[PDB]
Write an enzyme that holds these catalytic residues in place. Structure first.
Site: not given
Ligand SMILES: Nc1nc2c(c(=O)[nH]1)N[C@H]1C(S)=C(S)[C@@H](COP(=O)(O)OP(=O)(O)OC[C@H]3O[C@@H](n4cnc5c(=O)[nH]c(N)nc54)[C@H](O)[C@@H]3O)O[C@H]1N2
Ligand SMILES: Nc1nc2c(c(=O)[nH]1)N[C@H]1C(S)=C(S)[C@@H](COP(=O)(O)OP(=O)(O)OC[C@H]3O[C@@H](n4cnc5c(=O)[nH]c(N)nc54)[C@H](O)[C@@H]3O)O[C@H]1N2
Ligand code: SF4
Ligand SMILES: [Mo]
Length: 720
Positions: A46, A137-138, A305, A342-343
């Protein structure tokens, strides 16, 4: 072949890798990792494929307006757009009071954008309706840290990874969601093979393929699992009385002062044989996890998460901290309780800067009258200008929008129509015909733009400068590497002009650039235990991140909080080697939180657990990673994971389309059969806009942090 290398930060995960952007004057041509940042020049796929995203022409480059609801988004000048935005906001306040307007932001916003949005609203308009996606998230981790330690954010850093001799990784798919860090965890077990890794997750992921033990517990039962570990630790006398007798307090199941015997008495409720059946795990795993945890030279937990996206999120966070506290696996190299963010910017932008509805910058709180005065002073407001009531938290914000109570909302760098829980409910809320929704959004395929009344085109990523603060308290500057395209403007600049035009006092928004706002934020932090006065732009231009606390240009920053000699908030002349100063007596707190379940548990009629997860190639809603062909080659579309000995015994083959249905909706998905989901669990990813999984997901929230429980709801499956 680049001429200039511009130092910044990866646009994606909370690992917060430093990045160098090669520009052939004016155009970015290449990208490498920053050899001088924590990632040591390593970027994951990525990160390394960011240049196509930055170069994409599929951008929002002019302001757009939707004259009427259900209309068509059409071009409009920046001036008509700014007047329209400012007049609507002023008009709403004038008629209906500050609480009729809201900011809905992001841990992807630069720390400076979030700092200005938060000021305009809290000090300018007089509303505490400023929230954002770190709420999704956090927020559980913030609560866990504040209730356990009195202050937010990890007390260690990523460098502790290099020294842990045990990793307890729970609720975290580190390899798919934090790939750089997972490699550092893998690296460590390579170098010292006597390193133990426990992975606790209902799903068997790539993360478990370096684990000594994978605990595949039943969703929601991890509180009981972790109390049970504490019972073994106490029972086999693996605890650390020298530590906890001096450094720890104990709160019973009602939150009243208790003691070690109280804790022992309570824990009797969590015996391994009984808790092993609740959790659906071999009892040997509890003894194993506990002994590894406690016997190890240095233990580090890392979670994400699966712990936080829960109605017991704060409580789970508490339970992780309880283990570190009863064993003293804390405040020493290798040993800490490390919540993963996460973010890229939840930590610096939203949490540290107080850009949530109940919060104020740098550790201050809305309900705390002294904190409001502290801020009214620093910001030069009248007394009482800052409202004493917390504004709407995210879920309730969007409910208020739906009721008509919030009439004008800014959405900035988030895609809430795609990522908020219980989508049908939210899409109805977002369709209120009398609402004014302004989106600051860079990519026009973001589904939320379909509800926007006005769209402003921003500068993306390294088209402007600004700070991101990752999960280890690292504040890192991204410098500007390229001009923004078309009519894209820095959101900092747009916010100032919106404020001015909307009748905010111009001394409140006295900033030309992101640098100006940074020096004020430095000032507003000075003297707090979040102090980073010492992080001048000059230092941030030269260095690859500084870790706070860092209160002077000569201070190197802080690795170990709470530790005398390491943490400058701890007096050099303090009697004890540690000092948890976010508690009035200097003691962290073990909380005797009762273990419950999900808010929507399975039953006869909905007999499955439904979870939702992250997948390595795809960043959230795919408006960025989607612009990269290689990122589509493996998982191009959505699927639903199904357990093998659940599939066969119910008559479901691999590949066959199925209907995942929950009390709230139904959805056809391609089945993906493996041993990933333990029996009784299915799992869907959320990056496909053709499959808005958050329509099936419920909306319940932790009553303290107000994080939604995306990780658990109840479902059924049938063959299409
Ligand atoms: N490729 C990629 N990487 C990312 C992101 C992305 O969109 N794409 N987003 C980023 C962001 S904002 C975040 S918040 C992080 C999130 O990163 P993670 O939280 O590490 O990833 P998730 O799959 O949301 O994590 C959920 C894990 O918790 C598990 N889980 C489900 N139910 C339970 C439960 O009851 N108890 C426990 N202990 N675990 C459970 C799920 O099986 C899963 O494998 O990743 C970040 N990095
Ligand atoms: N079912 C389910 N839903 C979830 C989660 C899950 O685990 N399960 N995870 C939750 C968590 S941890 C998180 S962090 C949230 C994240 O959820 P979102 O924050 O809704 O997802 P993103 O795709 O990061 O959205 C970021 C947006 O910003 C736009 N963007 C990129 N660069 C710029 C810029 O410079 N300026 C502006 N204005 N916009 C820009 C991108 O096009 C994108 O649309 O999702 C949550 N939603
Ligand atoms: S900050 Fe996260 S998405 Fe970006 S290079 Fe490092 S591990 Fe990969
Ligand atoms: Mo997140």
């Amino acid at each position: 072949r680049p001429e200039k290398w511009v130092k910044g930060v990866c646009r994606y995960c909370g690992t917060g890798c430093g990045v160098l952007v090669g520009v052939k004057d004016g155009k970015a041509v290449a990208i490498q990792g920053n050899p001088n940042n924590h990632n040591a020049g390593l970027l994951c796929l990525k990160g390394s494929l960011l240049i196509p995203v930055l170069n994409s022409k599929e951008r929002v480059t002019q302001p757009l307006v939707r004259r009427h609801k259900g209309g068509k988004l059409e071009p409009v000048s920046w001036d008509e757009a700014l007047d329209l935005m400012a007049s609507r906001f002023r008009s709403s306040i004038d008629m209906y009071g500050p609480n009729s307007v809201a900011w809905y932001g992001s841990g992807q916003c630069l720390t400076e954008e979030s700092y200005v949005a938060n000021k305009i609203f809290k000090g300018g308009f007089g509303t505490n309706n400023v929230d954002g996606n770190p709420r999704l998230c956090m927020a559980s981790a913030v609560g866990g840290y504040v209730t356990s330690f009195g202050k937010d954010e990890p007390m260690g850093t990523y460098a502790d990874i290099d020294q842990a001799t045990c990793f307890f990784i729970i609720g975290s798919n580190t390899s798919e969601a934090h790939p750089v860090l997972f490699r550092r965890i893998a690296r460590r077990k390579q170098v010292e093979p006597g390193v133990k890794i426990i992975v606790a997750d209902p799903r068997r992921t790539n993360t478990s393929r370096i684990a000594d033990m994978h605990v595949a517990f039943r969703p929601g039962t991890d509180l009981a699992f972790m109390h049970s570990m504490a019972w073994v630790i106490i029972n086999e006398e693996l605890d650390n009385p020298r530590f906890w007798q001096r450094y720890v307090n104990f709160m019973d199941a009602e939150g009243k002062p208790s003691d070690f015997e109280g804790y022992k008495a309570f824990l009797e409720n969590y015996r391994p044989e009984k808790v092993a059946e609740i959790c659906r795990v071999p009892v040997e795993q509890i003894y194993g996890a506990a002994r590894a945890f406690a016997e190890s030279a240095a233990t580090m937990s890392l979670w994400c998460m699966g712990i936080n996206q829960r109605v017991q999120g704060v409580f789970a966070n508490n339970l992780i901290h309880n283990l570190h506290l009863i064993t003293g696996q804390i405040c020493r190299p290798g040993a800490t309780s490390f919540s993963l963010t996460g973010q890229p910017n939840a930590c610096g932008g939203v949490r540290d800067g107080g850009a949530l509805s109940h919060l104020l910058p740098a550790g201050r709180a809305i309900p705390n009258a002294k904190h409001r005065a502290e801020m009214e002073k620093l910001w030069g407001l009248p007394e009482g200008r800052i409202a004493p009531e917390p504004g709407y938290h995210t879920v309730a914000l969007f409910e208020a929008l739906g009721r008509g109570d919030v009439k004008c909302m800014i959405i900035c760098e988030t895609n809430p129509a795609h990522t908020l829980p219980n989508l049908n409910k939210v899409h109805k809320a977002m369709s209120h015909p009398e609402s004014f929704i302004v989106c600051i959004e860079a990519f026009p395929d973001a589904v939320t733009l379909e509800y926007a009344d006005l769209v402003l085109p921003p500068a993306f990523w390294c088209e402007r400068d600004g700070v991101y603060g990752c999960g280890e308290r690292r504040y890192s500057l991204t410098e500007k590497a390229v001009d923004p395209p078309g009519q894209c403007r820095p959101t900092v600049n747009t916010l100032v002009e919106f404020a001015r035009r909307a009748g905010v006092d111009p001394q409140l928004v006295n900033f030309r650039n992101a640098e100006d706002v940074w020096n004020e934020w430095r000032m507003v932090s000075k003297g707090t235990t979040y102090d980073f006065w010492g992080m001048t732009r000059e230092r941030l231009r030269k260095e690859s991140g500084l870790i706070w606390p860092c209160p002077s240009e000569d201070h190197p920053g802080t690795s170990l909080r709470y530790v005398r000699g390491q943490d400058p908030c701890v007096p050099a002349d303090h009697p004890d080697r540690f000092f948890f100063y976010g508690k009035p007596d200097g003691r962290a707190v073990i909380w005797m939180r009762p273990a419950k379940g999900a808010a929507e548990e399975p039953d006869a009629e909905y007999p499955l657990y439904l979870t939702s997860m992250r997948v390595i190639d795809h960043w959230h809603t795919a408006t960025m990673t989607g612009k990269v062909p290689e990122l589509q080659k493996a998982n191009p579309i959505a699927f639903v994971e199904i357990n093998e000995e659940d599939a066969a015994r119910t008559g479901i083959k691999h590949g066959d389309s199925v209907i995942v249905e929950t009390r709230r909706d139904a959805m056809e998905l391609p089945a993906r059969v493996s041993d990933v989901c333990r029996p009784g669990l299915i799992a869907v990813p959320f990056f496909d806009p053709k499959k808005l999984v958050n329509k099936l997901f419920l909306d319940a929230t932790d009553p303290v942090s107000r994080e939604p429980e995306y990780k658990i709801c109840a479902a059924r499956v049938r063959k299409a």
